[PDB]
Amino acid sequence: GADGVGNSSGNWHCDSTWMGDRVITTSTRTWALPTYNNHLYKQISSQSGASNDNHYFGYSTPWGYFDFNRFHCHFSPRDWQRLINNNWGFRPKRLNFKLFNIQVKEVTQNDGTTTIANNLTSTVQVFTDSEYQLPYVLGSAHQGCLPPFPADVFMVPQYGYLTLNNGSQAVGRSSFYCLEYFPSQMLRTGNNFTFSYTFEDVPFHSSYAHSQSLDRLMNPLIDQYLYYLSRTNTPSGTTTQSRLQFSQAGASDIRDQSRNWLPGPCYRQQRVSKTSADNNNSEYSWTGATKYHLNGRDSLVNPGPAMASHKDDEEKFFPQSGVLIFGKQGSEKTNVDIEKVMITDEEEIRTTNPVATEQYGSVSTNLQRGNRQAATADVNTQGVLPGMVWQDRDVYLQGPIWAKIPHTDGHFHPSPLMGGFGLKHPPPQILIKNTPVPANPSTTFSAAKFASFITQYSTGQVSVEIEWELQKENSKRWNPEIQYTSNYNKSVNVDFTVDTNGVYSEPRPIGTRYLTRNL
């Protein structure tokens, strides 16, 4: 699209409509973009000394990108609630994007006095990496997505990436991608950039919780017909004499019943409690946390494989890195106290996946014989096994929406671990930069790189609309399901509202599983 200077390049679309089966969440926000790295690509690396587990090598670019991989960039409390309360599941189908009403300003810091003014002509160029030839950054839970609250103006993030490294230094194989080596489209004012995408058949996120659970799944009333090993030894006057007898598992017997499927896999996490007291006093934050390691650098295992966060009656506990944790609007960056964060809870799964903090089961160790007692041992890490079945990490309104499946020789069940939809070809990276403006050059020629540009930034609005599909409920469940509600009682502030000084804020994390489906 194209037009004039006194012509709005696009209108403001920010609705949300439900169609019974679909529902489209349109949404627009105003943004701003500075000139990063003063227009140059800069090489960047870990700090020489820095622990090995923390080295790196890569580049930062003068390019800034766009991102809305956060559910709340599309759903509004209320809306989300609608969804989350009457749908067995849902998934994204297609999207449409558009930047417009772009405007380029140029600040002038003459002595003690700045003065911003329109640089009409100068441009901002955009380009979408629709061929995925660029290090996909999104999906890395970074923060600089869209504001949950419309009215909020925002700054565009700067693109940076990482290649290979042998400590703080580069290794040859590492590649250096240059963003100008693409065909950016250049916008001036009166210019807009639209583009549209279509998702790929993915599974509806399961937005329901299970009423039955693996173990308790058969019918009480009837005993099976298969037998199991009831007792081993037997009374012989005073002493026992080994004599194995078997029984037919019934209701009273349950624990012993024969089955057909196994809980999901696991990778044991340390348990910490919301109650300061209980927790051993010391620094096992890193030392005790569950991790894995590549090329000799141990990394953390955050968002551990999807597994319930606490047994019955222990909402007080949680994994050291088995859950998602968001900050309460305002919460500072580092070492903030428990009271400043919102920890997610995944009890809803208990029913199928193991509890993060407790071992999977316990396999037998030795082979018993008359002169040898029967061994056994608990298992803290069980990789996928036939017959296992499980549930993936719920979603949360202010959580990630999707993530790119890495291009590898092999993947195994790609639901992104941080939760979300695992996409092979996700929404392409959208980039934006401000074509430089060489400030006054010298009369006599010089072949040096230009270094003195006009100080200036850009701004303008952006809009994103997405169509989601739904799987409606359908249970013959007689008694009421659970629903997500807002507290009745009076409060000094409404949830998901602007305070007295107009600061919007999300009180709690809102999950997705409320409706109840049987297993």
Epitope: N37, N38, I44, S45, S46, Q47, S48, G49, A50, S168, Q169, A451, S452, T455
Partner: antibody, heavy 120, light 108 residues
Framework: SDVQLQESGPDLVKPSQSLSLTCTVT?????????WHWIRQFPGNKQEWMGY???????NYNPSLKSRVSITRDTSKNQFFLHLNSVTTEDTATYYC????????????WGQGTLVTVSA | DIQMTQSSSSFSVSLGDRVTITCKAS??????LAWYKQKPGNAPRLLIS???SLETGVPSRFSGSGSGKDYTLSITSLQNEDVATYYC?????????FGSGTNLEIKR
């Protein structure tokens, strides 16, 4: 004010001669990390950055000085050296060696400094 | 080369007072600026790097702020150890360049 590292070298040098200084480091290894720099201060006050040598042995020099400066290293000794040729009176100054916490930032540790005067 | 200019050439202050020093760059440094302290007859010492990050062992009284062209170093309550000249240094691009320095005479 405070730091560690020690420079050594002749106090006096004749003009057209070459200046050679050595910086001996203790409490740290020249390899494995950090870039070691040379900086000088003219008697008036200003600081001027001469150049550096990386842990890997790569060097970078100030463009003004580039033609007559050379920085080298002796890992065994844990010392790095500065060689400045075609010295002039302007070269008189206190020379410092310093470590650079590298990657993001700069000079974490500085030497005492050695005064070098260029006179006939 | 990027040129750094430091504000007050000299200040006199006593223990306990708050002092502020300014440094501005010819071009946008992008917070790659460090502050050093130098005592008489002594070599410089690193106070702050990355414009605002305190070096290990540096007291909380020291703080730095700034962005773009202009940066500032502030000492909340001067201490006797504080007497010295302070220099700002840019490491955005080679060659690295230093400011002219500000002499703080603490000591009545």
């Amino acid at each position: 004010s405070d730091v560690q590292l020690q420079e050594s070298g002749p106090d006096l040098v004749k003009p057209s001669q070459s200046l050679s200084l050595t910086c001996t480091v203790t409490g740290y290894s020249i390899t494995s990390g950090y870039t070691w720099h040379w900086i000088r201060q003219f008697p008036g006050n200003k600081q001027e950055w001469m150049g550096y040598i990386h842990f890997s042995g790569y060097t970078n020099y100030n463009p003004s000085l580039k033609s007559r400066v050379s920085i080298t290293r002796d890992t065994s000794k844990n010392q790095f050296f500065l060689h400045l040729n075609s010295v002039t009176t302007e070269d008189t100054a206190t020379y410092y060696c310093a470590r650079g916490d590298y990657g993001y930032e700069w000079f974490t540790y500085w030497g005492q400094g050695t005064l070098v005067t260029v006179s006939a | 080369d990027i040129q750094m200019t430091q504000s007050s050439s000299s200040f006199s202050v006593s223990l306990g007072d708050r002092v502020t020093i300014t440094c501005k760059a010819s071009e946008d440094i992008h917070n790659r600026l460090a502050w050093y302290k130098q005592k008489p007859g002594n070599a410089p010492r690193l106070l702050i790097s990355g414009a605002t990050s305190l070096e290990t062992g540096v007291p909380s009284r020291f703080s730095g702020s700034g962005s773009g062209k202009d940066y500032t170093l502030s000492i909340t309550s001067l201490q006797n150890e504080d007497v010295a000249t302070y220099y700002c240094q840019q490491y955005w691009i080679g060659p690295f360049t230093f400011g002219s320095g500000t002499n703080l005479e603490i000591k009545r």
